[PDB]
Design a protein around this ligand. Structure first.
Ligand code: GDP
Length: 168
């Protein structure tokens, strides 16, 4: 993507969060194509810091060990974008996604952040619609951050450029 190259050459800070198995790594791979590449969590956290040109991506699983949440606070200041990846077939765990999202948003350090929600795995038959996910997440209630929900399939990259377009 020319749009990805443009975005990353600019000076952005971006958080990508979601439960394990949401599709975070796959989404990033569709753009990164092994260039920059795969790096272990910063000591004392579960947070992967990946630098793409002038852009810093911070990636982590939410919904695991509760004591991990404190490790994230240092990372919040100056974040331009929060990318929330939601597995659209995981009806059973959407409640944890909701809980952690609103926990994260409560931080004054994230007041500047715009939130892109990727409704991922939209290829799967019988998945929740983006509208249902938006309803459950009560996104219409977020008035203090810009937000957008984007249906996607991380495997084919379908929807990913449109999500990125909303960001840029
Ligand atoms: N059917 C389907 N599977 C996906 C999609 N995106 C990711 N997966 C699969 O779900 C699993 C977890 O994806 P991964 O990127 O590792 O998620 P992460 O834990 O959030 O980093 C992998 O086996 C992926 O191949 C999707 O859009 N559709």
């Amino acid at each position: 993507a020319k749009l990805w190259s443009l975005f990353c050459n600019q000076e952005h800070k971006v958080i990508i969060v979601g439960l394990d198995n949401a599709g975070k790594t796959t989404i990033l791979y569709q753009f990164l194509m092994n260039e920059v590449v795969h790096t272990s969590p910063t000591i004392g956290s579960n947070v992967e810091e990946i630098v793409v040109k002038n852009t810093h991506f911070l990636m982590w699983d939410i919904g695991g060990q509760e004591s991990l949440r404190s490790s994230w606070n240092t990372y919040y200041s100056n974040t331009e974008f929060i990318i929330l990846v939601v597995d659209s077939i995981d009806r059973e765990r959407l409640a944890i996604t909701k809980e952690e999202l609103y926990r994260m948003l409560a931080h004054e350090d994230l007041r500047k952040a715009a939130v892109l929600i990727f409704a991922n795995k939209q290829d799967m038959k019988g998945c929740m619609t983006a509208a249902e996910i938006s309803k459950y997440l009560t996104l219409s209630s977020i008035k203090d951050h810009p937000w957008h929900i984007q249906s996607c399939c991380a495997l084919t990259g379908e929807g990913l450029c449109q999500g990125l377009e909303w960001m840029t």
